[PDB]
Amino acid sequence: YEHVTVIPNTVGVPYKTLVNRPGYSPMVLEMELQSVTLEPTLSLDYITC
Amino acid sequence: YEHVTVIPNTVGVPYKTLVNRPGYSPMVLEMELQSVTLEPTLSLDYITCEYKTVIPSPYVKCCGTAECKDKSLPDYSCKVFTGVYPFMWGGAYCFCDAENTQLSEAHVEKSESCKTEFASAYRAHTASASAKLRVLYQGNNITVAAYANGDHAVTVKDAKFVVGPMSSAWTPFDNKIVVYKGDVYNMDYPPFGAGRPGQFGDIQSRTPESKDVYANTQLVLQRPAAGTVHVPYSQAPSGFKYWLKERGASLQHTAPFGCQIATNPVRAVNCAVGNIPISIDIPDAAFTRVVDAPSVTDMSCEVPACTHSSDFGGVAIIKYTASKKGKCAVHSMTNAVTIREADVEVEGNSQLQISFSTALASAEFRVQVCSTQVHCAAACHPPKDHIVNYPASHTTLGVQDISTTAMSWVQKITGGVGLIVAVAALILIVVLCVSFSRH
Ligand SMILES: *[C@@H]1O[C@H](CO)[C@@H](O)[C@H](O)[C@H]1NC(C)=O
Ligand SMILES: *[C@@H]1O[C@H](CO)[C@@H](O)[C@H](O)[C@H]1NC(C)=O
């Protein structure tokens, strides 16, 4: 019951995914991105003022 | 009619049987065997238990020489030791210095525990089989029971029937069996009066209250220490008392085909071996005339979803047109497909949905609904799960097993060479017939 799919990294575009498990009515799920955050690991060297 | 059928000895799989009386609507009877018990004939050989070493006070013969008296006790042991000078709290028990002797005597008996704590050695030879069968007869579940030898007719609700004899005579019990409280062991116990010391059967009696007993315990009395009043003797390590350690595994776990062993009485339950014949006679009152049953037309079958699995993974919707309201029997003419439902209520121009089990990936099968066959073409998919906790019910499949594209593929692969062989034969013929007009 694990469905693996690949969606483009674009916010605000609804994507349709069809899960068809045999003997069950097909189901379409719409997926929507809202934010993709890239948090880098920071290391403070020094400050200036 | 008198209907004879053979069903496999497997618990939890319901089998449907089609009774076809000419001029009468077919009748489907659903039978499922609940339990099959194999109670073997028991012959009590003997009982064994813990012994008790009865050791009386030693006969100290002071200033004299003691004499052993010959008694007929089992494992009777007596030994006279010379030159004993035993000491008590206030010195020597004997006035004489050296001519005093110690007579040591000992004998073995059954312990009291023999009435409660005991092992029995039985001789099992033949088993009487009996079965309890549930039959879906006329919309009702009826439960019957009879011994499956083929010579016990049971008539319930006007249905006369007899069961067995079993096709296979296999039994999990051997000739020699040993029974202890709730555990049964297949063991070649030593015969009665020939036990070995330190082994199973060192002390044997015939019944829990008998008075004579056989014993082979190797009791050997040793010489007592100087000035010590005690009775040293060689220990008799009871084979029964440590029998409870090297037992291994009882037959409950080791018997093949999943036989369950119970005691009081000892019996083998649900031994999945072979098939069983059952003959059921029933007069015409259960039967319904072909004219009295509704007829049908314009039958079509569609399988919108099918998966070949242990459960009812196939569902088929049959659109039809009938003539009147009534009960109709459904039966598969193909052994590879099994329908859960046996009887349906037909009305008119309606449609029916049935659940079926199959092991074949494709299923081209004809179903005789209301004494009329309809062909259904299906394709079934493998299931996601590998382990089921209940056994399958669609197991009847072999090597001539129809499938999907496969047989078209083996057709397309069989583009043989016989055309090229024929044109080479033509060349050979036209060479021979230049001068082969005679032979
Ligand atoms: C219980 O003990 C009685 C007497 O000691 C004996 O006759 C009987 O077989 C025993 N039953 C069980 C189930 O142990
Ligand atoms: C008969 O018993 C079986 C199992 O208990 C059940 O599935 C079936 O519906 C019953 N049928 C009737 C008519 O009682």
- Residue B18 pairs in a beta bridge with B28
A1 touches chain B (CB under 8 A): yes
CB B85 within 8 A of CB B130: no
Q: Which two tokens stand for residue B124?
A: 């099992």
- Residues 7-46 (A) with a CB less than 8 A from some CB of B: 22-24
Distance CA B388, CA B30 (A): 24
CA distance B318 to B330: 12
What is d(CA B309, CA B394) in angstroms, rounded to the nearest whole number?
8
Instruction: Give the ligand 1 atom nearest the CA of B181.
Output: 14
The one-letter code for the residue type at B329 is: A
- Which stretch of DSSP H or E encloses residue B324? none
Spatial separation of the C-alpha atoms in residues B433 and B98, rounded to whole Å: 131
| Closest ligand 1 atom, residue B208 Cα | 7
Ligand 1: centre distance to CA B179 (Å): 13
For residues A43 and B131, what is the distance between their CA atoms, to the nearest angstrom? 80
Q: B36, B269, B268: which is closest to B130 by C-alpha?
A: B36
- Please provide residue B302's backbone torsions phi and psi, each rounded to the nearest 5 degrees: -130, 135
The string over B81-101, giving b where at least 16 C-beta atoms fall within 10 Å of a residue's C-beta and e elsewhere, is eeebebeeeeeeebeeeeebb
Q: Decide: helix, strand or coil at residue B110.
A: strand
Ligand 1 near B207 CB (within 6 A): no
Angstrom distance (rounded) from CA B278 to CA B167: 11
Residue B48 to residue B213: CA distance in whole angstroms: 10
Site of tokens 């000491």: B87
Measured from the Cβ of residue B143, the count of other Cβ atoms closer than 10 Å reads 10
Residues B266 and A28: their CA atoms lie apart, in Å, by 60
Measure Cα distances from B96 to B62, B91, B226, B397 in Å.
7, 13, 15, 96
CB contact under 8 A, B307 and A1: no
Name the strand (E) or helix (H) holding B87.
Answer: strand B87-88
Asked if B307 is an interface residue toward chain A (Cβ–Cβ < 8 A), one would say yes
The distance of A14 to chain B (nearest Cα, Å) reads 30
Q: How far apart are CA A22 and CA B307, in angstroms?
A: 7
Q: Which residue is it, tokens 């015939």?
A: B206
Query: Which residues in B390-415 are b (16+ Cβ under 10 Å) and which e?
Result: eeebbeeeeeeeeeeeeeeeeeeeee
Length of chain A: 49
Instruction: Tell me which H or E stretch contains B429.
Output: helix B418-432
Measured between CA atoms, how close is A32 to chain B, in angstroms? 29
- Asked if B113 is an interface residue toward chain A (Cβ–Cβ < 8 A), one would say no
Q: What is the CA radius of gyration of chain B?
A: 39
Find out whether the peptide bond into B165 is cis, omega within 30 degrees of 0. yes
Cβ atoms B270, B11 nearer than 8 A = yes
Residue of minimum CA distance from atom 11 in ligand 2: B141
Ligand nearest to the CA of B340: 2
Closest among B189, B179, B190 to B42, alpha carbons compared: B179
Sheet arrangement for strand B44-48? B183-186, B176-180, B119-123, B44-48, B203-205, B214-215
Question: Do residues B224 and B232 make contact, with C-beta atoms less than 8 angstroms apart?
Answer: yes
Spatial separation of the C-alpha atoms in residues B33 and B13, rounded to whole Å: 8
Residue owning tokens 């070649």: B188
Q: Which residues of A touch B307 (CB under 8 A)?
A: 22-23
Q: How far is A1 from chain B (nearest CA, A)?
A: 9
Q: Which helix (H) or strand (E) holds B5?
A: strand B2-8
* Helix/strand/coil for B121: strand
Inter-residue contact B320 to B57 (CB < 8 Å)? no
Give me the sign of the Cα torsion angle B35, B360, B3, B343.
positive
Partners of B105 in the beta sheet?
B78
Q: In whole angstroms, how far apart are CA A1 and each of A22, B253, B380?
A: 11, 37, 18
d(CA B77, CA B268): 46
Which residues make beta-bridge pairs with B82?
B101
The ligand that comes nearest to the alpha carbon of residue B135 is: 2
- Which helix (DSSP H) or strand (DSSP E) does residue B289 occupy? none
* Pick from B240, B262, B272: nearest CA to B51: B240
Q: How far is CA B153 from the centre of its chain?
A: 24
Which residues are CB-contacts of B387 (< 8 A; sequence separation ≥ 6)?
none
Among B409, B48, B370, B347, residue whose Cα is nearest residue B195:
B48
Residue from B208, B203, B267, B260 nearest B237 by CA:
B203
Task: Report which protein residue has its CA nearest ligand 1's atom 10.
Answer: B116
Which residue CA neighbors atom 1 of ligand 2 most closely? B141
Q: What is the DSSP letter of B108?
A: E
The string of DSSP letters for A1-49 reads --------S-TT--EEEEE--TTS--EEEEE--------PPP-------
> Residue B135: helix, strand or coil by DSSP?
strand
Residue B388's identity, in one-letter code, is V
Rounded Cα–Cα distance for residues B42 and B59 (Å): 47
B182 CB within 6 A, ligand 1: no
User: B21 burial class (0-12, 13-18, 19+ CB within 10 angstroms)?
Assistant: middle
CB B80 within 8 A of CB B103: yes
Are the Cβ atoms of B313 and A1 closer than 8 angstroms?
A: no
Six-digit token string for B373: 């066959």
Provide the experimental method for this PDB entry.
cryo-EM
CA B421 – CA A14 distance, rounded (Å): 64
Which position has the token pair 């197991």? B395
Q: Which of B121, B128, B116, B132 is nearest to B44 (CA)?
A: B121
Name the β-bridge partners of B377: B364
Distance CA B4, CA B160 (A): 12
Q: From CA B331, how far away is CA B336, in angstroms rounded?
A: 12
Provide the 8-state DSSP code for B381: B
Instruction: Decide: B115 in ligand 1 pocket, CB within 6 A.
Output: yes
- Ramachandran angles phi, psi of A27, nearest 5°: -125, 130
Q: Which tokens in the block code for residue B271?
A: 């031994």
**Quick check: bond before B265 cis, omega within 30?**
yes
User: At B331, which amino acid appears?
Assistant: H
Integer Cα distance of B228 and B58 in angstroms: 12
How distant is the Cα of A26 from the closest Cα of chain B, in angstroms?
12
- As given in the structure block, the two tokens for residue B409 are 């593929």
Are A23 and B313 a contacting pair at CB < 8 A?
yes
Closest CA to B369 of B334, B326, B329: B329
- Tokens matching residue B119: 């092992």
The reply to whether ligand 2 has any atom less than 6 angstroms from the CB of B415 is no
Beta strands, E only, B112-205: 119-123, 127-137, 140-147, 154-156, 159-163, 176-180, 183-186, 203-205
Cβ distance B381 to A1 less than 8 Å, yes or no, reads no
Residue-wise over B279-309: b if at least 16 C-beta within 10 A, else e?
Answer: bbebeeebbbeeeebbbbeebebebebbbbb
In terms of Cα–Cα distance, which of B232, B212, B195 is closest to B72?
Answer: B212
CA distances (Å), origin B60, targets A33, B225, B420: 105, 14, 115
Helix (H) or strand (E) holding B411: helix B406-413
Structure tokens of B89? 């709290």
- Residue B256 DSSP one-character state: G
CA dihedral B173, B176, B178, B182 (to 10 degrees): 20
